[PDB]
Amino acid sequence: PVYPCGICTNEVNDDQDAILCEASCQKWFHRICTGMTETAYGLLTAEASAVWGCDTCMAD
Amino acid sequence: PVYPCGICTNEVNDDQDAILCEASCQKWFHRICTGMTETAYGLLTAEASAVWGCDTCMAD
Ligand SMILES: [Zn+2]
Ligand SMILES: [Zn+2]
Ligand SMILES: [Zn+2]
Ligand SMILES: [Zn+2]
Numbered sequence: 171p172v173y174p175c176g177i178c179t180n181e182v183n184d185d186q187d188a189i190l191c192e193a194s195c196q197k198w199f200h201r202i203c204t205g206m207t208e209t210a211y212g213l214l215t216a217e218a219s220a221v222w223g224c225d226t227c228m229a230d
Numbered sequence: 231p232v233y234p235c236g237i238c239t240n241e242v243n244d245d246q247d248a249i250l251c252e253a254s255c256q257k258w259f260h261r262i263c264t265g266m267t268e269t270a271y272g273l274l275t276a277e278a279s280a281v282w283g284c285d286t287c288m289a290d
């Protein structure tokens with residue numbers, strides 16, 4: 171079970187909407203599990219100079 | 231008290247779209263100077279999970 175999603179623990183494939191948490195942990199998340207819209211997601215992933223952090227890393 | 235835009239050296243004021251580099255240095259940049267679009271700008275300021283880094287910090 172290779173890149174486990176941080177929220178749901180199931181594997182993240184390339185043909186799923188996935189984001190890396192560059193804020194710290196370096197875990198991937200299914201976009202769906204994080205609750206983030208396709209509209210936020212596609213834009214984040216189109217701006218290279220933008221980077222994201224998960225709910226847990228932004229909490230500390 | 232002056233905030234020079236890390237690209238153009240001119241002050242960043244309140245009536246101007248601006249963005250802080252939290253990857254690293256922590257200078258303010260006018261949105262216009264970065265060549266960042268308004269939609270990316272709205273996402274980045276809206277979403278607290280999304281942080282921005284300038285070309286110099288992202289570069290190295
Ligand atoms: Zn998931
Ligand atoms: Zn994280
Ligand atoms: Zn400027
Ligand atoms: Zn910077």
